[PDB]
């Protein structure tokens, strides 16, 4: 709702206010924006740091885990105020589940996924899809990382009749593999990988808000130079036995909603009521 800029705010944001695309007009977008981050460790931290810094209006965070007593949500928020006092930080000081995940998302304009568990990753997309929200998902384990921008702009469930942004299921159809799953606790993590990926995640979120890419298009089709409906899956491999290689960042363009997707496709048996009840039980492992 805020229409004008504080001398306080004008001073803080002037460095990125004077860039093509980001006027008093472009900045107010971010200040009224409401972004949510699911997961506070690893990808959460840098993602949150670069939203905070950018002056995203409200920044949510969801993690019931503690540090290695004190929840990691709290630790991080305490950190973020130092970067930017002005944003409203909103800690969900527990872990997301089917019972709540519906409740935890309906408020927020853009969803970031840093969840680190495959079951949860599927859950979010489902909900995000149903509620009609854009997902910037991102993953990192060991020496490798990857990122993608799903359901932007958010196309209603089952509307296959129009060129329409792919869901996480549409992409990554049925896998997760049961015994091929490594965790960040299991397999470790190099710092710059999770860092690159988080920072980029924030990058995509900011973009979505500032250029208003979650806004459905004018019977007109959506420009393909946005890479929204046909979005790249950027894969970062970190080779600590080599310098930056031509095959360091590979960009795999992806298909629009799979007409037969379980969730966002034609004849989906997926209901918000469903997930709550335990309907698509996330027993895929």
């Amino acid at each position: 709702t805020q229409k004008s800029l504080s001398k306080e705010e004008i001073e803080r944001y002037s460095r990125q206010m004077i860039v093509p695309g980001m006027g008093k007009e472009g900045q107010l977008r971010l200040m009224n924006a409401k972004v949510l981050i699911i997961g506070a460790g690893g990808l959460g931290c840098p993602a949150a740091q670069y939203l905070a810094g950018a002056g995203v209006g409200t920044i949510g965070i969801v993690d019931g885990d503690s540090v290695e007593g004190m929840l990691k949500v709290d630790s991080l928020i305490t950190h973020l105020i130092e970067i930017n006092p002005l944003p409203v930080y909103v800690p969900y000081r527990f872990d997301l589940t089917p019972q709540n995940a519906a409740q935890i998302i309906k408020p927020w304009d853009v969803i970031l996924d840093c969840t680190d568990n495959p079951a949860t990753r599927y859950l979010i997309s489902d909900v995000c899809v149903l509620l009609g929200k854009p997902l910037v998902s991102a993953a990192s384990v060991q020496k490798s990382g990857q990122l993608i921008v799903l359901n932007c702009p958010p196309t209603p469930q089952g509307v296959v009749n129009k060129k329409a942004a792919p869901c996480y299921r549409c992409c990554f159809k049925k896998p997760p593999p049961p015994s091929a799953q490594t965790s960040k606790g299991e397999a470790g993590i190099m710092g710059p990988v999770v860092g690159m990926m988080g920072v980029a995640q924030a990058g995509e979120a900011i973009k979505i808000l500032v250029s208003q890419l979650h806004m459905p298009p004018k019977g007109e089709e959506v420009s393909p130079e946005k890479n929204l409906v046909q979005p790249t899956l950027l894969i970062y491999t970190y080779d600590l036995n080599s310098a930056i290689g031509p095959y360091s960042f590979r960009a795999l363009k992806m298909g629009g909603r799979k007409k037969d997707c379980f969730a966002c496709g034609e004849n989906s048996t997926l209901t918000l009521d469903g997930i709550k009840s335990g309907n698509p039980n996330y027993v895929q492992f």
Binding site: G39, R121, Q146
Partner: protein, 100 residues
């Protein structure tokens, strides 16, 4: 047919820290009809592997985990495991990442 094959997404670990792989194939399969990508999976897993099978292919099919791309194009629309390989094609095997 000489082609370049790549790994990424914590798969190449299986193939001794190697991502780029160039090996020429026989133009014809075992039963004389042209090489399919059912072939490459079998050839690779049996010969090119440097590790124990469970992680790449199980029950005579690739693990649901991995995506396959032909010239950075979805494998599913272009042939989906029964694809006549081309004389200079690029095939990419990336294990979908579910950790963060």
């Amino acid at each position: 047919i000489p082609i370049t094959v790549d790994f990424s997404g914590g798969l190449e670990m299986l193939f001794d820290n190697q991502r780029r792989h160039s090996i020429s194939l026989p133009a014809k399969d075992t039963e004389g009809k042209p090489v399919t990508i059912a072939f490459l999976i079998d050839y690779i897993c049996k010969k090119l592997m440097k590790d124990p099978t469970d992680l790449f292919v199980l029950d005579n099919h690739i693990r649901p985990g991995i995506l396959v791309l032909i010239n950075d194009a979805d494998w599913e629309l272009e042939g989906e495991e029964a694809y006549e390989i081309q004389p200079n094609d690029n095939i990419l095997f990336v294990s979908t990442l579910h950790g963060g």
